[PDB]
GROMACS .gro file of C-alpha atoms in nm:
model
  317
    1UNK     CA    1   3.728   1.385  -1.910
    2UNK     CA    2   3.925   1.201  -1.683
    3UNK     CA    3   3.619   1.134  -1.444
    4UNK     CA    4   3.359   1.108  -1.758
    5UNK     CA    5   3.610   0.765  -1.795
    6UNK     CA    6   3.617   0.659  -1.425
    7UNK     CA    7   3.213   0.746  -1.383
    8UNK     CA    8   3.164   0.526  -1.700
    9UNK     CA    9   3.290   0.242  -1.555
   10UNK     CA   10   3.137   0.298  -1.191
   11UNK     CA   11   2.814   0.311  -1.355
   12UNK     CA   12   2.938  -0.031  -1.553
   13UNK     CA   13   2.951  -0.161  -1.210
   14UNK     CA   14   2.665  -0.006  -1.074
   15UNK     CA   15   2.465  -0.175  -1.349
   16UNK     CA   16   2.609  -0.500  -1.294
   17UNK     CA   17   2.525  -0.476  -0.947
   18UNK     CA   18   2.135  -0.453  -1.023
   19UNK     CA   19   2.170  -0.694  -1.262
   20UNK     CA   20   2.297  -0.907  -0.963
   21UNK     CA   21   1.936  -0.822  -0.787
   22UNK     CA   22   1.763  -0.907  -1.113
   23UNK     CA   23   1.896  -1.244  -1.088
   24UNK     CA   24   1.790  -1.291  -0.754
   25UNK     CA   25   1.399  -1.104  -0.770
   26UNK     CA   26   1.389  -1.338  -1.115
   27UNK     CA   27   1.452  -1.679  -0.928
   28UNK     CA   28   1.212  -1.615  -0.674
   29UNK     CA   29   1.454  -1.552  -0.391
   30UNK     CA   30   1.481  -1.176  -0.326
   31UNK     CA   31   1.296  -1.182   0.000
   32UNK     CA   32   1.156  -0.918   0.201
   33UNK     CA   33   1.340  -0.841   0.491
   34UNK     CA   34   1.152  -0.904   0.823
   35UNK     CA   35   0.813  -0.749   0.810
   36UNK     CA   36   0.861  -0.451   0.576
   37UNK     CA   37   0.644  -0.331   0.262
   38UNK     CA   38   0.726  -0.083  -0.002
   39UNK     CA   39   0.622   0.209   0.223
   40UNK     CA   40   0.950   0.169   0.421
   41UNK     CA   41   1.147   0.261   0.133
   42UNK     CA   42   0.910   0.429  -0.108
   43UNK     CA   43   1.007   0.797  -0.013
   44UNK     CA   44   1.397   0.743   0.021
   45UNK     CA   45   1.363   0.606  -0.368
   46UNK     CA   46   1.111   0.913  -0.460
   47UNK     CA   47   1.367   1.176  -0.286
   48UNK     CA   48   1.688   1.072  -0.400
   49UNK     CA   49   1.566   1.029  -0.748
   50UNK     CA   50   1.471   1.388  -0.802
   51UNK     CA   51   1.804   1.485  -0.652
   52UNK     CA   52   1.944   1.280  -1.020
   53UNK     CA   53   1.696   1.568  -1.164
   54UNK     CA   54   1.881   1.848  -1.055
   55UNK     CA   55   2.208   1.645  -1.078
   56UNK     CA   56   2.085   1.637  -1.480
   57UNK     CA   57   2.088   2.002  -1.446
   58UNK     CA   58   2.443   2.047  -1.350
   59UNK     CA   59   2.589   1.800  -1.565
   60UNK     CA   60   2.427   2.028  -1.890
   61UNK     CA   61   2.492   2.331  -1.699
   62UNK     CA   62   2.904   2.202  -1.639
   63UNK     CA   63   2.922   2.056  -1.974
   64UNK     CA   64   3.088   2.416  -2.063
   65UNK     CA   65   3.285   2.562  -1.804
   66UNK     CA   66   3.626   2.434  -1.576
   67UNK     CA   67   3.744   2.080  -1.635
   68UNK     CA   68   3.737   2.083  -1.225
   69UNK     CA   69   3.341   2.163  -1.277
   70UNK     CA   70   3.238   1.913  -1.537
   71UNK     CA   71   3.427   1.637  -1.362
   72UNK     CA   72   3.193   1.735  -0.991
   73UNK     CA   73   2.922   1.739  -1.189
   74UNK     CA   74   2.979   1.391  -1.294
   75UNK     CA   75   3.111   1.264  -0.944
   76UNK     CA   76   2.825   1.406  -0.788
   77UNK     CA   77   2.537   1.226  -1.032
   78UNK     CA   78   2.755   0.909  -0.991
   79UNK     CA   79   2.704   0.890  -0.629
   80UNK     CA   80   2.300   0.976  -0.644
   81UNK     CA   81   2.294   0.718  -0.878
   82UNK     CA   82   2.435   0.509  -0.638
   83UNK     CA   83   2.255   0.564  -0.392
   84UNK     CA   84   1.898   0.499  -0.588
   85UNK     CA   85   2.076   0.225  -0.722
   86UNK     CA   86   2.108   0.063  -0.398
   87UNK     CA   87   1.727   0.200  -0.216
   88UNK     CA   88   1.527   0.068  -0.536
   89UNK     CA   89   1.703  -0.297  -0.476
   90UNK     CA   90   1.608  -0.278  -0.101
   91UNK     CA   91   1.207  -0.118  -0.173
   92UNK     CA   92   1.172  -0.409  -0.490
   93UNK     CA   93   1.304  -0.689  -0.213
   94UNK     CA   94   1.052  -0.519   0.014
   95UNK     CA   95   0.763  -0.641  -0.223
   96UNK     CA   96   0.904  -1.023  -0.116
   97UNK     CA   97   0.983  -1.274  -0.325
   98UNK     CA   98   0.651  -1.379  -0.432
   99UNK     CA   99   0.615  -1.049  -0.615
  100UNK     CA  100   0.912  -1.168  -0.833
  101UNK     CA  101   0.761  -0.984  -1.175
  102UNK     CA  102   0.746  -0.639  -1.030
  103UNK     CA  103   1.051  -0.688  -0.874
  104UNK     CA  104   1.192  -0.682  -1.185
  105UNK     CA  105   1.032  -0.437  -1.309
  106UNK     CA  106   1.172  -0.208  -1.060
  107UNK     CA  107   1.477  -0.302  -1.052
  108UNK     CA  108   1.520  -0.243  -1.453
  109UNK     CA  109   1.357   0.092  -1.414
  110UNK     CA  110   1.682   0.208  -1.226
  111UNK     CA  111   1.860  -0.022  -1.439
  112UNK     CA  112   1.709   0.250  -1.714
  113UNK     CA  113   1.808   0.544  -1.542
  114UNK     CA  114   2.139   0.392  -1.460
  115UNK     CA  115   2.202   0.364  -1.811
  116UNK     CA  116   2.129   0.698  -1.957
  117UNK     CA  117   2.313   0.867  -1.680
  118UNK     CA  118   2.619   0.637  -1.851
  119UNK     CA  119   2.476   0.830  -2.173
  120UNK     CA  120   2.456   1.164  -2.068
  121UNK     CA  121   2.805   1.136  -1.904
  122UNK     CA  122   2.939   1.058  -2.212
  123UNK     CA  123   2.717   1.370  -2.406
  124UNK     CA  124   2.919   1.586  -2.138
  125UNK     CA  125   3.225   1.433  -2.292
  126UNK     CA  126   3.132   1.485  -2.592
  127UNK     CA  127   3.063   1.828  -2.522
  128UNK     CA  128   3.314   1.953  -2.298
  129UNK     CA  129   3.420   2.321  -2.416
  130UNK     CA  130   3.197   2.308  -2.755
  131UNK     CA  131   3.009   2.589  -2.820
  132UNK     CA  132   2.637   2.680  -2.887
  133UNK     CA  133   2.659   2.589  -3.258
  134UNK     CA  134   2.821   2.244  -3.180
  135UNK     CA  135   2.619   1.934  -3.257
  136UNK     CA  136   2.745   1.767  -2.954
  137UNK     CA  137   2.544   2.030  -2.691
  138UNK     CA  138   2.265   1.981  -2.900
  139UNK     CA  139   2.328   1.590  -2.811
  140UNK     CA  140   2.391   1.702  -2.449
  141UNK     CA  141   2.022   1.864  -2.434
  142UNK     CA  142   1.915   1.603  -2.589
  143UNK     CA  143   2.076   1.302  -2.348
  144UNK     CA  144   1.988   1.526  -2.069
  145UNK     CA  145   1.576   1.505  -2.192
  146UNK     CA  146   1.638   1.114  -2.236
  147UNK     CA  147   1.753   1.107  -1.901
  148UNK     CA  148   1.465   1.257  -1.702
  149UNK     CA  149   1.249   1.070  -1.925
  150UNK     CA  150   1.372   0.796  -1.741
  151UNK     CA  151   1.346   0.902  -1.412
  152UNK     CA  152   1.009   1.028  -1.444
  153UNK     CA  153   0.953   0.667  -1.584
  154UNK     CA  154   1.109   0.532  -1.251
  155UNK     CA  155   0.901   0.791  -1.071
  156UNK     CA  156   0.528   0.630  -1.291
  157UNK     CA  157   0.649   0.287  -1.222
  158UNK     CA  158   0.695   0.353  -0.835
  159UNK     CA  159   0.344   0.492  -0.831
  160UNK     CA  160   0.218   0.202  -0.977
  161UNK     CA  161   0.406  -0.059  -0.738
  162UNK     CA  162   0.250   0.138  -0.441
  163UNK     CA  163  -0.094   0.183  -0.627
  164UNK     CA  164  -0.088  -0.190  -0.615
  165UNK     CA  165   0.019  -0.195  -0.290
  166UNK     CA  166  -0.282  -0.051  -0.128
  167UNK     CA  167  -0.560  -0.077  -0.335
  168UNK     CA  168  -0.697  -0.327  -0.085
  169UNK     CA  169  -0.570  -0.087   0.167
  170UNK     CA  170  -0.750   0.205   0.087
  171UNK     CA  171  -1.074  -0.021  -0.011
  172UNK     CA  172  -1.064  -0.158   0.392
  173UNK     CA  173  -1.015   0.189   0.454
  174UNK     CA  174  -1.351   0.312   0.288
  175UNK     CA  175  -1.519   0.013   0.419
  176UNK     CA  176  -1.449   0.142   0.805
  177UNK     CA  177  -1.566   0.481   0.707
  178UNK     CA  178  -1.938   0.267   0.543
  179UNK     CA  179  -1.956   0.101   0.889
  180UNK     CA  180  -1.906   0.395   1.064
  181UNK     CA  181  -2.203   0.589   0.832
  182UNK     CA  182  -2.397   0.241   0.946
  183UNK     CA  183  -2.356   0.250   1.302
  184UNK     CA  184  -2.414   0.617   1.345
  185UNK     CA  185  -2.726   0.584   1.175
  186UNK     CA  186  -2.825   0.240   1.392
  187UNK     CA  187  -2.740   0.433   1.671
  188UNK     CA  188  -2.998   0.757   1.543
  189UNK     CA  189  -3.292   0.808   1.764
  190UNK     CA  190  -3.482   0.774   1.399
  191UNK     CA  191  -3.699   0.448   1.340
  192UNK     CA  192  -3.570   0.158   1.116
  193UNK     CA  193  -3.788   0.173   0.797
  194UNK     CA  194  -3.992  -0.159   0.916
  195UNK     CA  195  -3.959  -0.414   1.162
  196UNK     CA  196  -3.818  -0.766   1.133
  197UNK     CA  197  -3.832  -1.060   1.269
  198UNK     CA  198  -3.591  -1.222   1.532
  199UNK     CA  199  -3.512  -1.541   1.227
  200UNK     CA  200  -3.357  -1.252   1.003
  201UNK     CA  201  -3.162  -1.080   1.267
  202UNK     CA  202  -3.035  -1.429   1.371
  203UNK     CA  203  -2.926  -1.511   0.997
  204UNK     CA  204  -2.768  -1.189   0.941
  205UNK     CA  205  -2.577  -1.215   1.268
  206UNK     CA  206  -2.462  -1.494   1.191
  207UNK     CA  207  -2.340  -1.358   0.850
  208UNK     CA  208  -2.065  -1.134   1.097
  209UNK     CA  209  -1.936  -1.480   1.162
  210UNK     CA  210  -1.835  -1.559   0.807
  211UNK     CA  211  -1.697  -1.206   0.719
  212UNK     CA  212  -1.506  -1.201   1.025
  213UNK     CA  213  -1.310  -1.528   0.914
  214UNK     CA  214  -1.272  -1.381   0.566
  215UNK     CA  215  -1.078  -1.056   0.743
  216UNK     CA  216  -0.897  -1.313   0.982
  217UNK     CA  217  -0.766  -1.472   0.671
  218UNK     CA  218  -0.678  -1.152   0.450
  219UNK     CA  219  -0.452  -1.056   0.743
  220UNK     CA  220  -0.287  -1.332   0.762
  221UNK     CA  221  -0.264  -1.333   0.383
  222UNK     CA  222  -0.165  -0.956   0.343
  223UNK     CA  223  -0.331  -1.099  -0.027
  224UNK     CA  224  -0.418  -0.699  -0.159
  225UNK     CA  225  -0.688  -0.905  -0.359
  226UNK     CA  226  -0.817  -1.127  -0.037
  227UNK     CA  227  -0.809  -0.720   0.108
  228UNK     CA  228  -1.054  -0.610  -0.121
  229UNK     CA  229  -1.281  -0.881  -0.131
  230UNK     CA  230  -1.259  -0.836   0.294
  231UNK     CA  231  -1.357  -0.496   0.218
  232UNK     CA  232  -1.713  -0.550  -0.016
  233UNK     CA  233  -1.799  -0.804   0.207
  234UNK     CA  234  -1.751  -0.629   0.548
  235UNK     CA  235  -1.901  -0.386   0.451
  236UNK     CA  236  -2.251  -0.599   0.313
  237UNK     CA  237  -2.238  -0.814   0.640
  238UNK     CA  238  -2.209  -0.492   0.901
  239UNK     CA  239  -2.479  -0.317   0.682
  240UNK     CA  240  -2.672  -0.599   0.731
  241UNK     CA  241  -2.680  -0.730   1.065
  242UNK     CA  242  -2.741  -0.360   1.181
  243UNK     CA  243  -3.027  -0.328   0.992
  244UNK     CA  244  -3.192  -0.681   1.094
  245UNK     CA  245  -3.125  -0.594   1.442
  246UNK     CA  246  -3.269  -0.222   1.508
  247UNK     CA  247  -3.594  -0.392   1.281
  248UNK     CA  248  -3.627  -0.685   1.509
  249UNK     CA  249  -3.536  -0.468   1.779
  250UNK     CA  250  -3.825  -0.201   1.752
  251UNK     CA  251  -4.075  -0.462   1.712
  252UNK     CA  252  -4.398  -0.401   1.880
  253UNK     CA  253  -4.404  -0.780   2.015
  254UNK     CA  254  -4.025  -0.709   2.170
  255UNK     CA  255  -4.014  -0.597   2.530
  256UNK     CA  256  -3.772  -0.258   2.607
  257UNK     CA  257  -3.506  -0.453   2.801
  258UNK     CA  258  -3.487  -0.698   2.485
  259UNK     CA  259  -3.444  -0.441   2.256
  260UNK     CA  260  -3.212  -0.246   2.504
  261UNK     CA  261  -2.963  -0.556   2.488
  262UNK     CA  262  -3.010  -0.611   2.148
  263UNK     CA  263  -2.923  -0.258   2.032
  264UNK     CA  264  -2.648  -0.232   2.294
  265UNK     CA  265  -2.479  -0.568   2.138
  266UNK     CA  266  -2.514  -0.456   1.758
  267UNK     CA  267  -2.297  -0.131   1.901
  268UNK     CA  268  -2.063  -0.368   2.059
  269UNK     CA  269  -2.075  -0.585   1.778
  270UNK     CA  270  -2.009  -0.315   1.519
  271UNK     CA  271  -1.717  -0.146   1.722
  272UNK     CA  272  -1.549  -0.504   1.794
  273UNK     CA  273  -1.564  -0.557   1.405
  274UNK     CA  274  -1.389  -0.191   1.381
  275UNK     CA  275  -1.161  -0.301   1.579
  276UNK     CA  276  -1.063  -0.597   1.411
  277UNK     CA  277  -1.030  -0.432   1.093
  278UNK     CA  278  -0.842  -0.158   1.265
  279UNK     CA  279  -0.613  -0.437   1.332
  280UNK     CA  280  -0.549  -0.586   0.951
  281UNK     CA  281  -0.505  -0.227   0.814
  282UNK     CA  282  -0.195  -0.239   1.097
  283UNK     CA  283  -0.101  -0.586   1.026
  284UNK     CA  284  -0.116  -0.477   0.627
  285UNK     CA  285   0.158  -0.244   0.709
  286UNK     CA  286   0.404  -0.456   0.926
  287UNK     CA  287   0.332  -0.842   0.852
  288UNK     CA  288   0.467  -1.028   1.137
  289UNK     CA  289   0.387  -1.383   1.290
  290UNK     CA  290   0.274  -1.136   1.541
  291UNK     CA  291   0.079  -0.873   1.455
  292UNK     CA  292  -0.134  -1.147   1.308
  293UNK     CA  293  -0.156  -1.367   1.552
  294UNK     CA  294  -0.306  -1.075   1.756
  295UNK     CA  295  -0.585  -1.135   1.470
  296UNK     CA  296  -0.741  -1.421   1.682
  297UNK     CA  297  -0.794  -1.230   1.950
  298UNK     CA  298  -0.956  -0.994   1.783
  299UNK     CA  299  -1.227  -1.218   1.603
  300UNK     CA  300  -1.295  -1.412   1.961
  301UNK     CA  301  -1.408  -1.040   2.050
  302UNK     CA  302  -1.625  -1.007   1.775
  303UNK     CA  303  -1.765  -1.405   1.851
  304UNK     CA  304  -1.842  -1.282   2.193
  305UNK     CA  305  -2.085  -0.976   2.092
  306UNK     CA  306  -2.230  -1.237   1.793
  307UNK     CA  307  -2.303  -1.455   2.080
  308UNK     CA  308  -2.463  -1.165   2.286
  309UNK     CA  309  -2.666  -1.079   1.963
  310UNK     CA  310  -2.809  -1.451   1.888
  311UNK     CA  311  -2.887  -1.496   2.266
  312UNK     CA  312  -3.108  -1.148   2.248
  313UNK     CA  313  -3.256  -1.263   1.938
  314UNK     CA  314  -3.379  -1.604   2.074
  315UNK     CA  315  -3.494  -1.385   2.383
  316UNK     CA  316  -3.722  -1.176   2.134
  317UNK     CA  317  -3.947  -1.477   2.009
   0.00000   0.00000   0.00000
């Protein structure tokens, strides 16, 4: 009893507290700190909230039984919820402070749980040395139900924040596997399926140019939308300047050394590109000046094999 009144009001506080954060993610100024995403706090949130599961557990389980046992029952779910309390504020100011919407979002989710762990404190009250028959343990099972639908809620709305936090991630990520499938079969000892003409492989190297500026930018962005469209049209602009250069490559009219260079440049080409987007996916996951900065360097490495490729293509007409 005497801790079901002290937990109510450090809960109180504990919700006032994230109403505090609210505030803040609302008026566009919970920032990130330094260079971290969601995934630096994503599992602390995940495991402490199923520790408030089994904390649910004990609080129906101590409902009947010591005085001593009901009031650690409560003690202990008041400091797990304090503790997901205070890792959901840090993972929703992890999303920065243009992401001000889900933020919030987050934040009232553990407001949520917050809230009905005030509830089922009180069922416990209410309960305390009733038996079976008594309409306040039916109440208790009951709050107890309310409360882990809340925390699975919590749990649905943290996979959707992360969902949303790598769907570009895991798009860039099938697009390096594509290029891969590409290169290995550029690299085949198989023939392409016709021949081209040095004019197409020039046009479609110079595509590389244009998609590599497009990933240059959605690194620099960390835009999870910019991502995506990086992805499609990597993938398109590898696909294609492989293809335009094993077909002008194995034409008849191009002499083995030509082709040699060519083919060796679309591998270099390819693999520099790999690289680069090697690169974002690590950017994507610690955005610093300087991790993206290191960007640059990476496209002038890709420019230099483009240049390789045009020169070998002018050397084929």
């Amino acid at each position: 009893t005497q801790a079901c009144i002290t937990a109510a009001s450090a809960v109180s506080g504990i919700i006032a507290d994230l109403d505090t954060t609210i505030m803040f993610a609302t008026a566009g100024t919970l920032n990130r700190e330094g260079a971290e995403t969601f995934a630096d706090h994503r599992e602390g949130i995940l495991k402490t909230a199923k520790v408030l599961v089994e904390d649910t557990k004990v609080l129906v389980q101590n409902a009947a039984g010591s005085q001593e046992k009901l009031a650690q029952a409560a003690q202990s779910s008041v400091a797990t919820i304090t503790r997901l309390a205070d890792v959901v504020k840090l993972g929703a100011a992890s999303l920065g402070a243009e992401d001000p919407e889900t933020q919030v979002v987050l934040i009232n989710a553990v407001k949520d749980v917050a809230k009905a762990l005030g509830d089922l404190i009180s069922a416990t009250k209410a309960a305390a040395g009733k038996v079976g028959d008594d309409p306040a343990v039916w109440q208790l099972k009951n709050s107890a139900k309310v409360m882990v639908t809340n925390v699975t809620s919590l749990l649905k709305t943290v996979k959707a924040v992360e969902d949303e936090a790598t769907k570009g991630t895991r798009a860039l990520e099938a697009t390096t596997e594509h290029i891969r499938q590409e290169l290995a079969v550029f690299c085949s000892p198989e023939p392409p399926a016709k021949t081209s003409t040095p004019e197409d492989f020039i046009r479609m190297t110079k595509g590389i140019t244009m998609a590599t500026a497009k990933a240059v930018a959605a690194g620099n962005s960390c835009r999870q939308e910019d991502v995506i469209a990086t992805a499609n049209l990597s993938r398109r602009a590898i696909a294609d300047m492989l293809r335009a250069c094993k077909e002008a490559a194995f034409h008849p009219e191009v002499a083995p050394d030509v082709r040699l260079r060519a083919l060796h440049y679309g591998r270099e080409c390819a693999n520099g590109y790999l690289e680069l987007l090697d690169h974002v996916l690590l950017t994507l996951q610690k955005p610093n000046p300087d991790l993206k900065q290191q960007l640059t360097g990476h496209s002038k490495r890709v420019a230099g094999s483009v240049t390789e490729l045009i020169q070998a293509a002018e050397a084929m007409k």
